[PDB]
């Protein structure tokens, strides 16, 4: 529980200076036509549900993947990451397409290693998982559409009281008696036409976009002291995707949030999950408390969780905690490939099962969070 | 595979816009009212509003304005629909034909664009140079207004300010200049632009940006000579003209915010304002400043006139009359009399127009006639909350019943000179004519002296010269009042038998076979005045005195047996002044001449049950105007009963009807009786203004109600009613309600006005122990018990503090004989978002007192409850729970079923709970009784806003969803694959144009099996926010196909206002996707087929392949459709 001094310059974590520095960058964005079927190459050896808007680090070694990515960069730059269910071996029916924005090839070690970073862009469901003899199977992809709904009062609105539906901005910022009182008149003036329908105003506030976003911002700040608009988007779609990425949940809940087609349903599901969630325990034991929900801060602009690659290419999603429990360390604190620029990771294990839950990030300078940073991963962390 | 049929049982009533101007003519002053899809055009006169035309458009009127370009004599009307169908209309009438022609039309939507949050704004240049529309964020759409722009092509001009609140055009500017207020992170600002048509872009405004109040809402453009604009916020009213500037802070407007306005002076010296809680203000502009001819403002005094209905649109009619167009209340027509000031109010109400919306809850109850339902709604909101009782049909309140074996005629008489009231009713059977006497409750058979004993009387009544007549089958015998002696008796010269008899006040014309004899009733004499014969036997005769004279009928109407023809001849002669050959085969059974609303008609009823109304000329000749209305399938007997200070005609048949005149056309209501064979107005001393009705079983005497098809009684509660249920055994209504109470600085909650909860007979406050700022408004919930006869509040139970009562059901549970009121509440606190605790409370009304039998505390909000087979089924938050009523009067949990959705809607049919939420996530369940748990059968999830849902039958389910649509989902239980079995296929789409809050099974017409039944199966009523009651029924595949073909063929014949295609209007519409309507047959389009002309009727049907019972009969006729369409009209 370290307050106030959170000195990290928390954006460096999201630049990946470990996966290389002078990485070649790519202009901007693309677009796949809604409800179209597409031929999107599938990069293998990745087993993770890539939420849209989430950065995905990658190191590529085998010649087939290197050639696939080379031809990819020379033709579009988008491949497919499939949301594998509990059953492995290509048991996936949904996914997201990754699109490249940074590229670097090394001739080191006698190999043509390609270091690449990508972010999810779209959401899709596979029709048929076609396999190619080259090694890089191309999947039959249907672009699953994104739904945005108007105000629930737009149908039952009164014309007169419409000019009275453009609210003055929130008073000051993140202050009590400027929220509990502003929101009351906000709900009273926005949903005044709920008297025509058969349901009270608070019910229509349970299906609101801005009210759900406010309640979620409250809980997330209650954990990590967030910077009001610390890149949290105003768009409910993007806000929902960010919250879904940063939530410490298991794979089934992530797939379920991925299946949801509307922002409001996604926000309601996240509220339910984040309200019914308390502890995070070791999967291989489902018996030990290696956290809580209060002991969780954010040294990354993307939240308490982000995707990082070890030098062997494996992608890890790490959860940041002030104080983890029942962890025993082994090995001197070393700093060869730390994803956090200034700490020296020490490998951590469960006190009983001895599984790689994460790392302890001890500091190097003295104006740092002193030896208090556990970056626990999800390969052993079942929400309990 | 649904095949459903939707029709409107009551047109929308809430007003969402009203304008005035010289539309119909440059001389008349018209008040145009748009209620939704209907446009009503009135004419403002001294007495009030006179309706002129009623047109129903293919869309929801979003914007309408009256503008007059150069070279026009009367104003034109520009209407924009919610589907962005713009048009310009023009009034055109030639004597009797009224047509609203479409000057221009064209869809103005964009391929891409999010509709604005403040909504559609439609403004017209005061010089009528262009039309400005703000439909989409960041884009101003401009429609040039030229005579050649008949397709309404528009170009978009970019606005850099995305949040625009209100925009209008300024008055007195060389180039078209707009003024608007917009939102910025720095606040709200007022800005102006100079729109240029040639350059197709904006320009520099005459006066630059000026900072305004943080809550500036509307802009009103002050007309010349002042100029500029007035910006009205929650606390200030400011006037902007560039250099000139004013600001006021009147404290009488701080209570509530102004939402509507209307200019009252052509020179804009005074303005009229209205706010949310319904009080009229009066903005005043002072032109006392005049330096060198320039007129400038000096003050902005604001005056409060009084309190009116909660207004959405104000409008000032001529001579101190204001039409307050209300949408959540009732429309008014008030007086701005500045001298009355009885207690401090400047307004007094003149009229009050019925407005059923918003209909929040309904229930169908057989209040008066068993079998025939009545709709009891929960209308209005805030101070306009009321209960409306809608009844279809005129009803007769029976007051006597004297059994008789098939009376073949009822005729009143007065056997008491100088009595001014009826004394006895002379019945006439097949062989005898009994004379029953009825003064008080008397039924004595007191025979008159002059009346024959054993005969079938054809007529008997009071004749001139204080004498009585009796046109028996033997001879027309005249009698006397005081001495009662047979003065004369005109026997047939050949001793023939009279076939048809007709008598007037002074004349009596009888027909013996094929010969007609005219006899005048001279004082104490009866001498024939004419004699002639016709081609065939006289089927019927009618000699009724028209307006004035009343002593000699200029014309007499007859019917021919072998010709099926009706002729009108002069009474003192036999010259055929006119003729007609209406139909054939079945002979006429009755002829009647009436004077409905100073217009004379001639009604002829054939023997098959069809009445052929026609117009008649009093002086000489007659019109044709052949309009055959099939009012039953039995011979119709026509009689005239005043009973209203108006004419009225009672058409006794298998479906008795009263034919009256509404404004200038003959309407046809139906009387709620099984069958009336004969009728007679008996204004007896003991029976004031009664009407003796004789069925085939007995003679009854009663009073008719008010000649009107639909009657809406209002019971004002002065608080918002939420839910309503009816309890039969107690003869009472259970209605939830809420009242707003301000939080005073004493720890209590004082009210704002006398409500139904604070004015009950007996009162109670909930006392259960299972678990701010001065000015805040807090809701207090009550359960009111309302009598079904007097509609007086018998009791008022007040719930706990911070407890919101959600649902309500009146049912008896388990083996208990008692019936209860079950109420499910939710304890809601401002701090928390989603409640944690609720309460299931069981009341029991007996001996005029409400007692809490049982009380269950649950963890959540009880959103709905149903009575699934002697077991309350409750929806606690996202869990559906089933309760069993124990023998000790205590609820016990039996089974649970956990969903991922909020079970807002619960509709059951046998053992199939239909569960939905506000996300259109319809879920279907089944309750297995042998095992005792719920099971999921089907599921249909689609992100969309769903307003209500109903179980049409075991397979199809109907609901209403976003953008005012309807849909039907059907489960294919015969599917061999589980994925399809577990799926709910969607088999119907329809853009209703209305927002449905409630569905309910029932019908407002008599429930007659009819042996053969009717082509429509089932009946579901829905009520909408605007106040429209609809009705959806199923159809067979053959009937659905026939009606679909007829609907396609009507669309090429009927010309709509604005030339909006019907297929486009009914297409399932949504912000993200619009599809064509399927599986729904528009009852309105089909029922409009009866109102088109005969050549158009021939055009519509030429290859319909009508018959399905063997053969096709490719001709398909045109009266065969009439038989089908009338059968569909009869279902509502
Ligand atoms: N075909 C083929 C092929 C060709 C070439 C290959 N090369 C082999 C040599 N590699 C150089 C090297 C090796 C070893 C290290 C030590 O770092 C390790 C080791 C093991 C696990 C982890 C880490 C760091 N780490 C976390 C800790 C937390 C944190 O913050 N960040 C992290 O990265 C781990 O989890 C550094 C550099 C370069 C690649 C190849 F491996 C395959
Ligand atoms: Zn473990």
* DSSP character string of B439-482: SSS-------SSS-SSS--SEEEEETTTEEEEE-SSEEEEEESS
Please tell me the class of the B4-359 domain.
Answer: mainly beta
B998/A198 Cβ within 8 A? yes
B902/A206 Cβ within 8 A? yes
Q: In sequence order, what E strands does B720-819 have?
A: 720-727, 732-742, 762-765, 777-787, 793-798, 803-811
List, as one string, the DSSP characters of A137-180.
PEEEEEE---B----TTTTT--SSTTTT-SPPPPSSSS-TTSST
Nearest alpha carbon, ligand 1 atom 3: A61
* Ligand located closest to A336 CA: 1
Q: CA dist B191 to A141, A192, B449, B880, Å?
A: 50, 29, 94, 55
| CA–CA separation, B311 and B323 (whole Å) | 10
Q: Of B32, B109, B36, which is closest to residue B74 (Cα–Cα)?
A: B32
C-alpha dihedral (A98, A101, A105, A109), degrees to nearest 10: -60
**B829: closest chain A residue by CA:** A202
User: Could you tell me the two tokens for B779?
Assistant: 């809701």
User: Could you tell me the two tokens for B123?
Assistant: 């403004």
Q: What CATH topology corresponds to A1-16+278-384?
A: 2.170.150
Report yes or no: B560 and B535 within 8 Å, Cβ to Cβ.
Answer: yes
| CA–CA separation, B803 and B781 (whole Å) | 7
Q: In sequence order, what E strands does B673-719 have?
A: 678-680, 691-694, 698-704, 710-716
| CA–CA separation, B606 and B637 (whole Å) | 10
CA atoms within 13 A on the CB side of B891: 26
Q: Which atom of ligand 1 is nearest to the CA of A313?
A: 41
List CB contacts of B361: < 8 A, sequence separation 6 or more: A198, B377, B378, B721, B722, B723, B724, B997, B998
Pocket flag, ligand 1, residue A339 (CB < 6 Å): yes
A166/B117 Cβ within 8 A? yes
User: What number of residues does chain A have?
Assistant: 384
Nearest alpha carbon, ligand 1 atom 41: A312
| CA–CA separation, A44 and B812 (whole Å) | 64
- Write phi, then psi, for B731 (nearest 5 degrees): 55, 45
Question: How many angstroms away from the CA of A291 is the closest CA of chain B?
Answer: 27
- Classify residue B973 by burial, with Cβ atoms within 10 Å: 0-12, 13-18, 19+: exposed
Q: If DSSP codes are grouped into helix, strand and coil, which group holds residue B1064? A: helix
Query: Cα A313 to the chain's mean position, in Å?
Result: 19
Report yes or no: B382 and A195 within 8 Å, Cβ to Cβ.
Answer: yes
Report yes or no: B795 and B850 within 8 Å, Cβ to Cβ.
Answer: yes
DSSP B1063: H
* Ligand located closest to A326 CA: 2
Pocket flag, ligand 1, residue A45 (CB < 6 Å): no
Q: What CATH topology corresponds to B396-710?
A: Methylamine Dehydrogenase; Chain H (2.130.10)
A207 in contact with B, Cβ within 8 Å: yes
User: Could you tell me the two tokens for B914?
Assistant: 């239909």
B217/A163 Cβ within 8 A? yes
Facing residues of B691 across strands? B702
Cβ count near B1076 (within 10 Å):
12
| A151 chain-B contacts, CB cut-off 8 A | 117
Question: How many angstroms away from the CA of B225 is the closest CA of chain A?
Answer: 28
| CA–CA separation, A237 and B602 (whole Å) | 70
Question: How many angstroms away from the CA of A206 is the closest CA of chain B?
Answer: 7
Report yes or no: B947 and B939 within 8 Å, Cβ to Cβ.
Answer: no
A152/B918 Cβ within 8 A? yes
Cβ count near B979 (within 10 Å):
7
| CA–CA separation, B944 and A265 (whole Å) | 11
Report yes or no: B782 and B793 within 8 Å, Cβ to Cβ.
Answer: no
Q: Of B74, B128, B133, B88, which is closest to residue B108 (Cα–Cα)?
A: B133
Q: Which residue has the tokens 């990658």?
A: A58
CATH 2.30.130.40 is held by the domain A31-143: yes
| CA–CA separation, B162 and B118 (whole Å) | 11
Pocket flag, ligand 1, residue A228 (CB < 6 Å): no
Q: What CATH topology corresponds to A205-276?
A: Methane Monooxygenase Hydroxylase; Chain G, domain 1 (1.20.58)
Ligand 1 pocket test target in A17, A107, A337 with most atoms within 8 Å of CB: A337
Please report, for chain A, the start and end positions of each structural domain, with discontinuous segments joined by +.
1-16+278-384, 31-143, 205-276
In chain A, % helix, strand, coil (3-state, to 5) comes to 20, 25, 55
A180/B833 Cβ within 8 A? no
| CA–CA separation, A301 and A226 (whole Å) | 9
DSSP B1072: S
Facing residues of B488 across strands? B478
Nearest alpha carbon, ligand 1 atom 29: A338
Q: CA dist B103 to A75, B89, B95, B150, Å?
A: 55, 5, 21, 7
Ligand 1 pocket test target in A13, A312, A316, A348 with most atoms within 8 Å of CB: A312
C-alpha dihedral (B957, B961, B967, B973), degrees to nearest 10: -40
Strands B500-503 and B657-661: unpaired
Question: How many angstroms away from the CA of B737 is the closest CA of chain A?
Answer: 12
Please provide the CATH number assigned to the domain covering B1016-1130.
1.10.150.910
List CB contacts of A105: < 8 A, sequence separation 6 or more: A66, A112, A113, A114, A115
State in Å, rounded, how far the first CA of chain B is from the last one.
24
Query: Cα A245 to the chain's mean position, in Å?
Result: 2
Centre of ligand 2 from the C-alpha of residue A380, in Å: 7
| CA–CA separation, B6 and B24 (whole Å) | 33
B943/A262 Cβ within 8 A? yes
Report yes or no: B15 and B34 within 8 Å, Cβ to Cβ.
Answer: yes
Q: Which experimental approach was used here?
A: cryo-EM
Centre of ligand 1 from the C-alpha of residue A363, in Å: 20
Cα B950-B953-B956 angle, rounded to 5 deg:
75
Cα B137-B142-B146 angle, rounded to 5 deg:
165
List CB contacts of B1045: < 8 A, sequence separation 6 or more: B1104
Strands of B691-694's sheet in order across: B396-403, B698-704, B691-694, B678-680
| CA–CA separation, B1113 and B1106 (whole Å) | 7
| CA–CA separation, B782 and B764 (whole Å) | 9
Q: Of B354, B359, B539, B416, which is closest to residue B1028 (Cα–Cα)?
A: B359
Q: Which atom of ligand 1 is nearest to the CA of A361?
A: 30
Q: Is A32 annotated as a binding residue?
A: no
* Ligand located closest to A352 CA: 2
């Amino acid at each position: 529980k370290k307050p106030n001094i959170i000195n990290f310059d928390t954006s460096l974590p999201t630049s990946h200076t470990y996966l290389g520095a002078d990485m070649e960058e790519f202009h901007g964005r693309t677009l796949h036509d809604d409800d179209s079927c597409q031929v999107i190459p599938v990069l293998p050896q990745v087993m993770m549900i890539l939420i849209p808007g989430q950065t995905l680090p990658l190191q590529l070694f085998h010649p087939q993947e290197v050639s696939m990515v080379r031809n990819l960069i020379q033709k579009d730059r988008t491949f497919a990451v499939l949301a594998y269910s509990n059953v492995q071996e290509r048991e996936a029916q949904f996914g997201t397409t990754a699109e490249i924005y940074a590229y670097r090839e090394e001739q080191d070690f006698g190999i043509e290693i390609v270091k690449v970073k990508a972010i999810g862009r779209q959401r899709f469901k596979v029709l048929e998982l076609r396999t190619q003899s080259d090694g890089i199977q191309q999947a039959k992809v249907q672009i699953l559409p994104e739904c945005v709904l108007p105000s629930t009062m737009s149908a039952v609105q009164l014309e007169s009281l419409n000019k009275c539906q453009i609210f003055p901005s929130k008073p000051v910022s993140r202050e009590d008696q400027c929220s509990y009182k502003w929101w009351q008149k906000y709900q009273k003036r926005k949903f005044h036409c709920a008297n025509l329908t058969s349901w009270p105003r608070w019910l229509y506030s349970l299906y609101d976009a801005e009210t759900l976003m406010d309640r979620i911002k409250k809980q997330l700040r209650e954990w990590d002291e967030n910077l009001k608009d610390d890149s949290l988007p105003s768009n409910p779609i993007d806000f929902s995707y960010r919250v879904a990425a940063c939530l410490p949940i298991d794979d089934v809940l992530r797939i379920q949030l991925l299946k949801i087609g509307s922002a409001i349903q996604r926000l309601r599901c996240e509220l339910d999950i984040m309200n019914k969630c308390t502890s995070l325990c070791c999967k291989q034991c489902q018996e030990t408390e290696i956290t809580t929900k209060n002991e969780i801060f954010s040294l990354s602009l993307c939240g308490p969780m982000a995707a990082y690659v070890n030098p062997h290419g494996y992608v890890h999603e790490t959860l940041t905690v002030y104080k983890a429990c029942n962890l025993n360390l082994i090995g001197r604190p070393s700093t060869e490939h730390s994803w956090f620029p200034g700490y020296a990771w020490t490998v951590a294990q469960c006190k009983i099962c001895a599984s790689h839950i994460g790392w302890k990030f001890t500091a190097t300078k003295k104006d740092m969070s002193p030896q208090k940073f556990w970056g626990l991963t999800r390969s052993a962390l079942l929400p309990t | 595979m649904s095949y459903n049929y939707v029709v409107t049982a009551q047109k929308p009533t809430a007003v969402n816009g009203c304008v005035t101007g010289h539309f119909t003519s440059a001389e008349d002053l018209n008040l145009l009212i748009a209620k939704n899809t209907r446009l009503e055009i009135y004419v403002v006169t001294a007495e009030g509003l006179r309706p002129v035309k009623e047109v129903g458009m293919y869309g929801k009127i979003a914007v309408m304005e009256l503008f007059r370009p150069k070279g026009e004599s009367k104003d034109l009307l520009f209407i924009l629909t919610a589907k962005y169908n713009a048009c310009i209309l023009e009034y055109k009438q030639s004597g009797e034909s009224i047509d609203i022609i479409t000057r221009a039309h064209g869809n103005v939507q964009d391929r891409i664009g999010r509709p604005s949050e403040t909504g559609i704004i439609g403004i017209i240049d005061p010089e009528c140079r262009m039309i400005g529309l703000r439909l989409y964020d960041g884009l101003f759409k401009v429609i040039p207004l030229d005579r050649d722009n008949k397709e309404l092509k528009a170009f978009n001009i970019r606005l850099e300010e995305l949040h625009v609140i209100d925009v209008k055009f300024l008055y007195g500017c060389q180039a078209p200049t707009i003024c608007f207020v917009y939102q910025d992170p720095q606040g709200r600002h007022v800005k102006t632009y100079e729109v240029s048509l040639r350059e197709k872009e904006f320009n520099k405004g005459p006066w630059k940006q000026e900072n305004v109040e943080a809550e500036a809402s509307m802009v009103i453009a002050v007309p010349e000579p002042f100029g500029g604009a007035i910006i009205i916020g929650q606390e200030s009213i400011t006037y902007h003209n560039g250099d000139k500037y004013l600001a006021i802070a009147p404290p009488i407007i701080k209570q509530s915010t102004i939402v509507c306005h209307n200019r009252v002076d052509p020179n804009g010296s005074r303005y009229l304002l209205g706010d949310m809680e319904g009080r009229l203000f009066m903005l005043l502009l002072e032109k006392e400043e005049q330096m060198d001819g320039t007129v400038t403002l000096k003050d902005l005094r604001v005056e409060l006139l009084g309190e009116t209905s909660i207004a959405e649109c104000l409008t000032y009619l001529d001579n101190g009359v204001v039409f307050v167009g209300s949408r959540l209340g009732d429309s008014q027509l008030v007086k701005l009399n500045v001298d009355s000031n009885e207690q401090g109010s400047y307004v007094v109400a003149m009229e009050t127009f019925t407005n059923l919306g918003p209909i929040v809850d309904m229930c169908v109850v057989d209040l008066e006639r068993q079998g025939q339902g009545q709709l009891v709604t929960c209308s209005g909101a805030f101070k306009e909350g009321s209960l409306r009782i809608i009844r279809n049909g005129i009803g007769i309140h029976e007051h006597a019943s004297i059994d008789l074996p098939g009376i073949k005629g009822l005729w009143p008489l007065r056997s008491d000179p100088n009595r001014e009231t009826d004394d006895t009713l002379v019945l006439s059977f097949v062989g005898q004519t009994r004379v029953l006497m009825l003064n008080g409750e008397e039924v004595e058979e007191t025979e008159l002296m002059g009346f024959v004993d054993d005969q079938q009387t054809f007529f008997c009544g009071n004749v001139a010269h204080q004498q009585l007549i009796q046109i028996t089958s033997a001879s027309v015998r005249l009698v006397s009042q005081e001495p009662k002696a047979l003065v004369s008796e005109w026997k047939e010269p050949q001793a023939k038998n009279i076939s048809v008899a007709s008598c007037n006040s002074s004349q009596v014309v009888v027909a013996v076979g094929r010969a007609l004899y005219y006899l005048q009733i001279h004082p104490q004499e009866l001498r024939q005045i004419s004699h002639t014969e016709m081609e065939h036997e006289v089927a019927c005769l009618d000699i009724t005195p028209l307006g004035d004279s009343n002593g000699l009928s200029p014309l007499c109407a007859i019917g021919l047996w072998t010709d099926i023809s009706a002729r009108i001849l002069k009474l003192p002669s036999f010259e055929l002044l006119h003729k007609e050959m209406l139909g054939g085969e079945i002979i006429p059974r009755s002829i009647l001449m009436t004077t409905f609303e100073s217009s004379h008609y001639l009604l002829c009823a054939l023997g098959d049950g069809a009445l052929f109304y026609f117009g008649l000329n009093i002086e000489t000749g007659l019109l044709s105007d052949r309009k055959k209305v099939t009012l039953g399938t039995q011979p119709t007997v026509l009689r005239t009963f005043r009973s209203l200070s108006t004419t009225n005609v009672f058409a006794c048949s298998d479906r008795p009807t009263v034919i009256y005149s509404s404004n200038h056309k003959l309407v046809f209501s139906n009387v709620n009786l099984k069958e009336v064979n004969y009728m007679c107005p008996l204004n007896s001393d003991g029976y004031p203004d009664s009407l003796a009705l004789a069925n085939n079983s007995t003679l009854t005497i009663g009073t008719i109600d008010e000649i009107q098809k639909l009657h809406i009684r209002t019971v004002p509660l002065y608080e918002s009613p939420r839910k309503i249920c009816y309890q039969e055994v107690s003869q009472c209504f259970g209605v939830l309600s809420s009242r707003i109470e301000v939080q005073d600085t004493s720890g209590g909650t004082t009210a704002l006005r006398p409500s139904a909860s604070t004015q009950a007979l007996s009162s109670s406050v909930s006392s259960s122990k299972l678990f701010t700022s001065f000015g805040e408004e807090v809701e207090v919930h009550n359960l009111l018990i309302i009598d079904q006869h007097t509609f007086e509040v018998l009791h008022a139970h007040q719930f706990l503090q911070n407890e919101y009562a959600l649902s309500l059901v009146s049912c008896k549970l388990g083996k208990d004989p008692n019936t209860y009121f079950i109420v499910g509440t939710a304890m809601v606190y401002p701090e928390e978002a989603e409640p944690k605790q609720g309460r299931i409370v069981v009341f029991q009304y007996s001996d005029g007192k409400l007692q809490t039998v049982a009380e269950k505390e649950v963890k959540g909000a009880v959103y709905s409850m149903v009575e699934f087979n002697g077991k309350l089924l409750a929806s606690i938050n996202s869990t559906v729970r089933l309760y069993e009523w124990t023998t000790e009067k205590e609820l016990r949990t039996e089974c649970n079923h956990y969903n991922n959705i909020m079970a807002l809607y619960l509709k059951t049919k046998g053992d199939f709970i239909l569960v939905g939420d506000l996300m259109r996530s319809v879920l279907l369940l089944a309750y297995k009784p042998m095992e005792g748990n719920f099971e999921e059968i089907a599921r249909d999830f689609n992100p969309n806003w769903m307003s209500a849902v109903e179980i049409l039958d075991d397979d199809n389910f109907l609901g209403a969803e976003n953008a005012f649509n309807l849909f039907v989902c059907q489960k294919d239980s015969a599917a061999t694959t589980d994925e399809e079995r577990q799926h709910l296929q969607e088999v119907g789409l329809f853009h209703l144009g209305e927002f449905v809050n409630v569905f309910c099974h029932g019908s407002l017409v008599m429930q007659n099996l009819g042996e053969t039944s009717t082509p429509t199966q089932g009946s579901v009523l829905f009520g909408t926010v605007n106040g429209m009651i609809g009705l959806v029924t199923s159809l067979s595949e053959s009937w659905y196909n026939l009606l679909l073909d007829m609907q396609n063929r009507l669309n090429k014949v009927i010309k709509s206002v604005g030339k909006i295609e019907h297929s486009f209007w009914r297409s399932f519409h949504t912000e993200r996707k619009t599809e064509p309507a399927t599986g729904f047959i528009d009852g309105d389009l089909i029922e409009s087929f009866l109102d088109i002309s005969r050549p158009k009727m021939q055009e519509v049907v030429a290859n319909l392949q009508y018959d399905d019972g063997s053969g096709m009969k490719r001709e398909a006729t045109a009266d065969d459709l009439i038989k089908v369409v009338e059968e569909l009209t009869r279902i509502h």
